[PDB]
Amino acid sequence: NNIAPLDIVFETKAKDGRVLGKIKQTLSVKRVNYNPEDILFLRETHSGAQYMQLGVYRIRLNTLLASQLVSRANTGIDTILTMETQRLPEPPLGEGFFANFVLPKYDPAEHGDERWFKIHIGNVGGNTGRQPYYSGMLSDTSETSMTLFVPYAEGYYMHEGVRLGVGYQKITYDNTWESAFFYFDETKQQFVLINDADHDSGMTQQGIVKNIKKYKGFLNVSIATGYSAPMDFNSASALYYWEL
């Protein structure tokens, strides 16, 4: 993580064996990392959504509820204090799409000793390897459904689009054609999933692939088309939200 420890030990020892002193001190060396892909940057959409991006993760910074606050304030304050206002949608954090994943019930035989799982993203940016994008707590009584926003950039996905896999420990589904694949089709001008089933032909980011296999691990993967992100109570302005 661009840091390395070293240690200095002063050893003074008498001839008889009486240790005068063994003093240890730890020093840290920080390596300079000025890679543009590793340097965070600031962006703002035409809808007014301001976010920061470090590598693959995108984080909202500002908020755009002022107009709705004015609208409910023109009406009575009871209208301000409503559930519908607290679940008001927000603009997406830059260009991207929303994927809903439904994971099956926990199984000691299938999932293993540990119920929790780690969701990882694969071929993104210039990194072919895996990056842990989410951590989830499974339920032993029912299926678990969660929606994740996957960002996008111009040519951000190399060969075979972008991969999304999951690991439940004692097992990891990241083999060939096991993780969910996504790309950005220009003919439909939208984000398209690749491996929803077993297919003998399919158009992907780099052309026609004749062997598409259904994803494993995830019970159901869907693209939430036209889905707006709900109001967030854990963002940078979560303190103000909780206050109000």
Binding site: P5, D7, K24, Q25, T26
Partner: protein
């Protein structure tokens, strides 16, 4: 930063047939652990643990 698993393996075995787990290490003061394991790890790793 520092690998807690590798540090625990370095301290291992805890003269009992298992690994010196974090829970069993409530345990003692900084000077105490430095005296006990002064020949096994460093000041920064002790601080991290």
């Amino acid at each position: 930063m520092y690998s807690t698993a590798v540090l625990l393996n370095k301290i291992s075995p805890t003269r009992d047939g298992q690994t010196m787990t974090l829970a069993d290490l409530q345990y003692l003061s900084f000077s105490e652990l430095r005296k006990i394991f002064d020949d096994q790890l460093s000041w920064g790793e002790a601080r991290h643990l």
